[PDB]
Structures are given as structure tokens and as C-alpha cells.
Design a protein around this ligand. Structure first.
Ligand SMILES: CC(C)=CCC/C(C)=C/CC/C(C)=C/CCN(C)CCOP(=O)(O)OP(=O)(O)O
Ligand SMILES: [Zn+2]
Lengths: 346, 5, 314
């Protein structure tokens, strides 16, 4: 069918407004929901329908700044939301101590990403504090945890770290050698990339791995041509019509981006079947409320709405900006970032 | 649904 | 104790035991973004959680409060961390906590925080005795649950429990030979025990896989395992394999087989084999068979593969 663009713009708008208590389990990840909506509007070139300034202040109120004594550097970054009860402070005053207030790697990533998308120049971001916090999260094996207090560790956070370093245009935030080691060790016998060594290769972790390497600009340097060919084969094999995340698993709209973007980074997305992919993605479009779901005749959400749109973007949908396959922002925004970096370099 | 966190 | 849905449930704001604590509210400033609306009960539990948390109160009442906070939202990673802090401070019975988390995970098998919590507990107790069985149960409501397999590999590796996994794998593969997670588990076990260097083992495995392939010829997983355990030793270094596959082609054909063949042929060209120009043709002939009729959805890919072989061996 057709792409109900305006319907989707309204959808993202509502997401930025209010959510039903039914989404209470996203409380600590609200910033990533904001990202899906904002980057989603960006991708549809409709950022005008929101107040960039209000949102920017909200985002900055989520930054965990170093305290007077700077004894909390290892815990700086961004919060997913205000769930801890810390008094609203748009990175105006110094950090107010709190036994359990720390950043979350995925929130620092989506936070910075949102700020860039909204046009902010990151001047109020304590770049050094964030990088300090990032370093603190990396493990001996090269992977990362989400929070200093401890958490599971896997490829998801490796990608987050990469995005943070890339956006702050400073890789002192990680031990790139160890990170690359982790990424290599995650390659499976079937040639896909898993969440970690020995685990089942997966579309999500493969994207995270490849995209991270691309962000570091070491794809070719880390994997041999033979290796890259095997990886490409594994990825291209994910297309059934839409894309699934693992062999013998049903397709899911979001993989049109996870895998699609990987194929794009590997320069072979062009050899995939566009029509069947586009057709599937659209079959999951909610023509009534807007957005997309993982499967057809299923309820839509911010994640699939965003990734379904980015999936369409990969094939240059009429009416959708080109998404930067490795940074997960519109090319337009990836560019504004290039300019931003130049600015600093003076 | 796809819980990624 | 007092359940959140109990007819006699009382808001914390109305509980004597909590009179001394001032609830701490959440505030998203002037213009809240992606704001979730909360019920009286919900906001009540968390307004007190914030209070206790903010004061790092290692109390017994705090411990009980986390149970409610977790019931309201088990995805709140901070609540779980604090609960763990309390578990230690109050020196709680960890074997009891194991029962707790076991129930929680059953209800929310796709929650990251609950699996992490269980892993920490098992590390603390250094007791993996009930892990393999628990995971087997979770794998029953979803044999491909990534969280379950991840936890399973951790346990097995950490406490060296390989003795029965290969058997568990054999059993699950019988229940569904298409479960890619189980094939991965199989490779995990073997490569972490005997390894594939023992020609006796390699043979057993290649044989085992060919058997599964014959039962369900169209199964990417089985084919990926087969190619996986041989691709690094050199697919062309196995003359009998090429012919055994060519023999299947008639009855057990699939795009997976054809692809395997193309890969064998490419390994040969890779190792300056005899009939360079002849082999390349057998390959190209297959690439096209894939593009035009066998794996049409990847038509442009296969053609791309073909063009790549020609410009590389001519
Ligand atoms: C905010 C942002 C863009 C973050 C990027 C970094 C991350 C967190 C990437 C996650 C990629 C991903 C899709 C991971 C898999 C998620 N699961 C649902 C894992 C386990 O549950 P299953 O139900 O077995 O999942 P599956 O959907 O693979 O069958
Ligand atoms: Zn999905």
C-alpha cells in the first residue's frame, strides 16, 4: 500500500506528549523513547511540530554532572528519566550528590543523539565527565556495562559506547583495542555476530558490532575480505520478505533496519529485494493510529515506528530522509554533527 | 514487543 | 506481606511505620517529555522508594518496599540494585531470594534485570545446582529465548557443567531440528570440550548433521553448522563431501545445498585446483540456478556473487 506519513508524524507527536500507565516499564528508558520520536520526526522532516527549546532543557535536566568535589566522575553521563526524584536542573548548577544517581550508557547515547537532532551544540555537556563515566563502564574483555553500579554486559552497550565516542568526537572514552577484540570474538561459526563469544549470532548484535567498527573506521582492518564475505552472506540470508533476527525465526519490522543497515554498511543492501521488504514493513503499518508494529495486525510502538521508518529510509522512501546506517540519525543530522566537530577544532 | 533494555 | 491488590492494602502515606519519612516526588520540569501517567498507588509506592533510596536507608521496611516497587515495574534496574544492597546489609536468606526471582522470571522471561539479578545470586551462592533445570523450564515456554540460552551458557561455563549438555542438545534437536539456538548450543558444548580437531569427532558431527539434513533438507541451521565446522579447515579438502552432496541434489535439494556447493567450488578456485576454468563454470552455473530459480529473493546477490567469481578467476 502507501506510506501514511502524516499519520506517523502525529503518532510521534503523541509519544512526546503523554503515555498510558501501561508504559510504566519504560520509565527508566524514557530518553530512548524520546529519541525514537524525535529522530523519527527528524527522519520525516517534521521537527517543526515540537518546541526544540523545551525538549532540550528537559534533556539537559537528565545529565549527571560532576559534583563540587568531582568525586562522582565515574558516574557521569545521562539518566533515562527523572525517576530518582532529583530536583529539575537543566545542567545549570553543579551536581547534587545522591547515593544512587548515575548515568546509563544507553541514555548518554540517546541523550547526546537527541541534543544533536534538536540542533543543540553540546556546549552544556561535560564532555570529559561523560568520557570518564564511559571508561568506567568497560570490562576486561572489552565490552561494557550500562551503569557503574553493575549490570549485564554485551554488544548492545559496545555500540552505545562507540556512538558516544563518535559524537563527542573523542575515543578516549574506551580502550578501542579491547572493544575490537570483543567484537571479533563474538563472531559465530555461522559467521554472524552474537551478543558475546559463544552465543547465537543475532541480527541485533551483528548490527551493533559492524556499526561500531564502522564508527571507529576499522571495519576493513578488523575483518578480512574472506571474513566480510561470510558476514555479508549471513546477513543477506536474513531476508525472507521482511527480515528476521536469527535463522528460522519469524520476520520482525525492526530488523529491516538492524540487518538492512548492516547490509548497507557492507555495501550490498543494494542486492536485496526492495519490494518484498517494503511490502512487509507497510503490512505492519497501523493505518488508524499510525506507527508500525513488529508484525502485521499487531499494536504499534515507538521502537517499531522508528525502525520501520528507518527501514523504509534505507530504500529511499518518497518522503523520508536518508538515515545514516551506522550512527542511527538522519544523514542531515550526521552532517550537522560534522560541522559541529569542525567548529570545536579551532 | 521488543524489549531491548 | 501486604499485597498491592489486597482489599486491605494501605497507601504508604497512610502507614504508621512510614510516618517519619517524607515522600520524594518525581518532577520533569515545566514541559515534561514522554511523560507516563501514574495511578495513586503507583506514585505512592515510588514516592516512598525515592525517599528511602535518597537516604540510602538499609532498613527492613525498605527491603519490603522494593518488593512492591518491583511488582509495579520489574524493569527498574535501580530498584533491583538497591534490593541487592539490602540483601547484603540485612544479610537476608539468599536461598529464599532464589525462590523469589525464580517466580519473577517465569512471569517476565524477557526482562533483562531479572536475569541479571539471578546471575548475581548464583555467583554469591556459588551454587549452580538448580540452574540447568530452571532454564530448561523457561526454555519450555520459548525454546529460543535469548536470555535463557545466555544464562545457560554462563552457568555451564562458570561451573564447568558440560557432562550432560550434549545430550540435552540431542534431545531438543529432536523436538525441533530447526531451532537455531540449539544448533549453536551444540557447537558451544563440543568446541568447549573435545573440540573439532579430533577427526573422530569431526566425522561424528558431519555425519550427525547430514542425517538431520536428510530428515529436513530445508533447514539453514543444520547447513550452517555443517559448513561452520568445516569452512576453516578448507571445504575443498574433503573430496567425499562434494560427491555426497551432489548425490543429495536430486532428492534433498534446497538453496542451502546449492549454496554449499558454490562455496566448495570457490574454495577449490581459491586453492589453485585442477580445471580452474572448468570449476568456475560449475560455480557460475549454480549461482545462476540460485538467482533464476532456487533462491530468487536473493537474485541480485547471487548474480553479484557470480560476477565476483568471474572477475577473480579468469
Ligand atoms: C536506543 C538504541 C537505538 C540502542 C541501540 C543499542 C541496542 C540496545 C540494540 C539492541 C538490538 C537488539 C534488537 C537486541 C535483541 C533484543 N531481544 C529482544 C533479545 C532477547 O529476547 P528474544 O525474544 O529472544 O529476542 P528476538 O527478538 O531476537 O527473538
Ligand atoms: Zn522488533
Amino acid at each position: 500500500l502507501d506510506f501514511l506519513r502524516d499519520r506517523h508524524v502525529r503518532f510521534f507527536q503523541r509519544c512526546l506528549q503523554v503515555l498510558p500507565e501501561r508504559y510504566s516499564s519504560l520509565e527508566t528508558s524514557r530518553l530512548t523513547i524520546a529519541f525514537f520520536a524525535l529522530s523519527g520526526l527528524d527522519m520525516l522532516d517534521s521537527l517543526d511540530v515540537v518546541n526544540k527549546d523545551d525538549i532540550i532543557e528537559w534533556i539537559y535536566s537528565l545529565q549527571v554532572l560532576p559534583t563540587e568535589d568531582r568525586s562522582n566522575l565515574d558516574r557521569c553521563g545521562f539518566r533515562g528519566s527523572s525517576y530518582l526524584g532529583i530536583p529539575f536542573n537543566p545542567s545549570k548548577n553543579p551536581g547534587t550528590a545522591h547515593p544512587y544517581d548515575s548515568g546509563h550508557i544507553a541514555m548518554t547515547y540517546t541523550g547526546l543523539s537527541c541534543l544533536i537532532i534538536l540542533g543543540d551544540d553540546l556546549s552544556r555537556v561535560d564532555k570529559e565527565a561523560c568520557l570518564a563515566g564511559l571508561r568506567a563502564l568497560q570490562l576486561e574483555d572489552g565490552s561494557f556495562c550500562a551503569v557503574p553500579e553493575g549490570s549485564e554486559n554485551d554488544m548492545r552497550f559496545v555500540y552505545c559506547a562507540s556512538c558516544i565516542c563518535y559524537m563527542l568526537n573523542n575515543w578516549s572514552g574506551m580502550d578501542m583495542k579491547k572493544a575490537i577484540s570483543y567484537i571479533r570474538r563474538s563472531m559465530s561459526y555461522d559467521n554472524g555476530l552474537a551478543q558475546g563469544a559463544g552465543l547465537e549470532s543475532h541480527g541485533g548484535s551483528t548490527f551493533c558490532g559492524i556499526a561500531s567498527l564502522c564508527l571507529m573506521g576499522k571495519l576493513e582492518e578488523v575483518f578480512s575480505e574472506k571474513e566480510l564475505n561470510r558476514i555479508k552472506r549471513w546477513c543477506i540470508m536474513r531476508q525472507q520478505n521482511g527480515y528476521h533476527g536469527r535463522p528460522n525465526k519469524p520476520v520482525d519490522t525492526c530488523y529491516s533496519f538492524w540487518v538492512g543497515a548492516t547490509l548497507k554498511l557492507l555495501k550490498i543492501f543494494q542486492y536485496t529485494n526492495f519490494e518484498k521488504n517494503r511490502n512487509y514493513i507497510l503490512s505492519t503499518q497501523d493505518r488508524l493510529v499510525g506507527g508500525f508494529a513488529k508484525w502485521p495486525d499487531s499494536h504499534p510502538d515507538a521502537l517499531h515506528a522508528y525502525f520501520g521508518i528507518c527501514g523504509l529510509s534505507l530504500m529511499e522512501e518518497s518522503g523520508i530522509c536518508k538515515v545514516h546506517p551506522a550512527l542511527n540519525v538522519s544523514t542531515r543530522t550526521s552532517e550537522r554533527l560534522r560541522d559541529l566537530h569542525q567548529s570545536w577544532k579551532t | 514487543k521488543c524489549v531491548i533494555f | 506481606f501486604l499485597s498491592l491488590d489486597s482489599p486491605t492494602y494501605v497507601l504508604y502515606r497512610d502507614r504508621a511505620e512510614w510516618a517519619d519519612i517524607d515522600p520524594v516526588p518525581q518532577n520533569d520540569g515545566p514541559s515534561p517529555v514522554v511523560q507516563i501517567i501514574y495511578s495513586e498507588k503507583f506514585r505512592d509506592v515510588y514516592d516512598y522508594f525515592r525517599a528511602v533510596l535518597q537516604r540510602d536507608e538499609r532498613s527492613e521496611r525498605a527491603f519490603k518496599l522494593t518488593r512492591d516497587a518491583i511488582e509495579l515495574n520489574a524493569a527498574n534496574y535501580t530498584v533491583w540494585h538497591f534490593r541487592r544492597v539490602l540483601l547484603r546489609s540485612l544479610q537476608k536468606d539468599l536461598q529464599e531470594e532464589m525462590n523469589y526471582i525464580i517466580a519473577i522470571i517465569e512471569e517476565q522471561p524477557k526482562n533483562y534485570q531479572v536475569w541479571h539479578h539471578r546471575r548475581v545470586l548464583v555467583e554469591w551462592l556459588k551454587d549452580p545446582s538448580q540452574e540447568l533445570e530452571f532454564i530448561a523450564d523457561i526454555l519450555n515456554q520459548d525454546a529460543k529465548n535469548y536470555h535463557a540460552w545466555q544464562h545457560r551458557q554462563w552457568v555451564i561455563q562458570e561451573f564447568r557443567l558440560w557432562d550432560n549438555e550434549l545430550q540435552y542438545v540431542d534431545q531438543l534437536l529432536k523436538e525441533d531440528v530447526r531451532n537455531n539456538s540449539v544448533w549453536n548450543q551444540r557447537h558451544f558444548v563440543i568446541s568447549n570440550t573435545t573440540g573439532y580437531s579430533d577427526r573422530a569427532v569431526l566425522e561424528r558431527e558431519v555425519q550427525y548433521t547430514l542425517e538431520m539434513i536428510k530428515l529436513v533438507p530445508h533447514n539453514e541451521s543444520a547447513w550452517n553448522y555443517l559448513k561452520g565446522i568445516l569452512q576453516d579447515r578448507g571445504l575443498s579438502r574433503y573430496p567425499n563431501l562434494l560427491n555426497q552432496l551432489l548425490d543429495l541434489q536430486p532428492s534433498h535439494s534446497s538453496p542451502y545445498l546449492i549454496a554449499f556447493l558454490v562455496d566448495i567450488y570457490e574454495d577449490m578456485l581459491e586453492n589453485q585446483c585442477d580445471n580452474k576454468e572448468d570449476i568456475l563454470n560449475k560455480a557460475l552455473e549454480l549461482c545462476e540456478i540460485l538467482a533464476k530459480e532456487k533462491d530468487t529473493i536473493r537474485k541480485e546477490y547471487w548474480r553479484y556473487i557470480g560476477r565476483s567469481l568471474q572477475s577473480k578467476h579468469s
